[PDB]
Design a binder for this molecule. Structure first.
Ligand SMILES: *P(=O)(O)OCC(C)(C)[C@@H](O)C(=O)NCCC(=O)NCCS
Lengths: 134, 49, 72, 50, 50
DNA sequence: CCACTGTTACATTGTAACGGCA
DNA sequence: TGCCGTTACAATGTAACAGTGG
């Protein structure tokens, strides 16, 4: 356990995630009958502003197959939330053209390094070449 | 620690310089002693003749 | 010019605008930057120019002009 | 022997460098919040020095 | 320093509570005896108002 | 000149797959 | 195992720049 988990925050995250999924059409509940699903979803909608009861709602009406996705989404949300405080822990997202990405990834799998590690090593070698010449 | 290391480097530089000086002195002495040995041999030959 | 660095960073570190700082004034009392703030200001100046400033030299920057005097 | 300590100094220097950027960015962020909060919020309400 | 630090938070919370309490009043208190008298004036005002 | 288009460099959120660890 | 961090993505949205043609 590296990041401490906060209930009033992670529970709001879960409520928002489930509401978003429902708005997207995902079946939040395990009830095939539309009436029970609608009733549970309405309970959830009016359940806003409640961690201790949204958790129970999840335990009682949650679709079995979304548990893992919700869990990993919350893991990622927690990690990003804790890492976004400091610059050095933040992450910068970029888009790479397919050939360039293919070659860079080829190098990374070949060397067993990650994209960050592979690029760091390559830049370090470029710098070293500069110093050799200079 | 940085200043400590820099000062140790400076001491090291000084002592290396002076030992280079003693190395030069040793070389000069070596030349002198080669000449001395040559003289010794010459004197020996003169004795025998 | 290059002083635009200093006269920018100072403000960003003290909440004042670019023209608010006067060369005659002093950071410690005439800018409102306290003990912690002056350490932070000098360390940000150190960071900006990718250089180093020992404690002794750093303590002689209480006035606005000194911030450029050691730089240029 | 001393060169190893020099390399350790380099490691320490890079760590210092990182910390320095952290601190300067933190002060940059703080600046504006001080400016706004000086509207009596910081006076005694927010600054619960306890 | 460590002893003072351990003492610190209690003292600071006490100071803040006292500051709030006195500021709530028009008077600023400076002594336990001063507080005792203020209490007496409070009782007098109470028994008058009642 | 001016408008509209193409492009890059991010952000933002979600997900699957590894791998560590009790 | 079951959780938890971690990576490498995917999809979409935006700001900013560079082009293009009238
Ligand atoms: P001032 O009341 O803001 O307090 C400043 C401080 C003691 C917190 C600190 O930032 C500071 O100014 N220290 C002076 C420099 C110093 O102590 N350097 C030590 C280097 S190892």
């Amino acid at each position: 356990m590296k990041y401490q988990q906060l209930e009033n925050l992670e529970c709001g995250w879960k409520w928002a995630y489930l509401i978003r999924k429902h708005q997207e059409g995902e079946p939040i509940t395990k009830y095939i009958e539309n009436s029970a699903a609608h009733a549970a979803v309405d309970k959830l909608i009016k359940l806003e502003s409640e961690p201790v009861r949204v958790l129970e709602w999840i335990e009682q009406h949650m679709n079995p197959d979304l548990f893992n996705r919700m869990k990993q989404t919350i893991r990622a949300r927690r990690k990003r939330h804790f890492n976004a405080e400091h610059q050095h822990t933040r992450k910068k997202s970029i888009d790479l053209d397919f050939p360039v990405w293919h070659r860079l990834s080829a190098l990374s799998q070949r060397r067993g390094n990650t994209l960050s590690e592979t690029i760091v090593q390559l830049i370090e070698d470029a710098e070293r070449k500069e110093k050799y010449a200079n | 620690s940085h200043k400590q290391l820099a000062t140790e480097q400076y001491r090291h530089v000084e002592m290396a310089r002076e030992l280079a000086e003693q190395s030069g002195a040793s070389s000069d002495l070596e030349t002198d002693h080669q000449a001395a040995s040559d003289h010794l041999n010459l004197v020996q030959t003169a004795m025998r003749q | 010019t290059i002083e635009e660095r200093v006269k920018k960073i100072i403000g960003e570190q003290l909440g004042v605008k670019q023209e608010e700082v006067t060369n005659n004034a002093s950071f410690v009392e005439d800018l409102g930057a306290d003990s912690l703030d002056t350490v932070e200001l000098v360390m940000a100046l150190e960071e900006e120019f990718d250089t180093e400033i020992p404690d002794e030299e750093a303590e002689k920057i209480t006035t606005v002009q000194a911030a450029i005097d050691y730089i240029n | 022997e001393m060169e190893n300590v020099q390399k350790k100094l380099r490691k320490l220097e890079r760590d210092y460098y990182q910390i320095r950027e952290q601190v300067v960015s933190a002060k940059a962020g703080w600046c504006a919040v001080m400016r706004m909060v000086k509207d009596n919020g910081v006076e005694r309400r927010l600054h619960r020095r306890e | 320093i460590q002893s003072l630090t351990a003492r610190a938070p209690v003292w600071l919370a006490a100071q803040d509570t006292l500051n709030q309490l006195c500021e709530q009043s028009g008077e600023t208190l400076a002594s336990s005896n001063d507080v005792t008298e203020y209490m007496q004036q409070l009782l007098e005002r109470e028994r008058e108002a009642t």
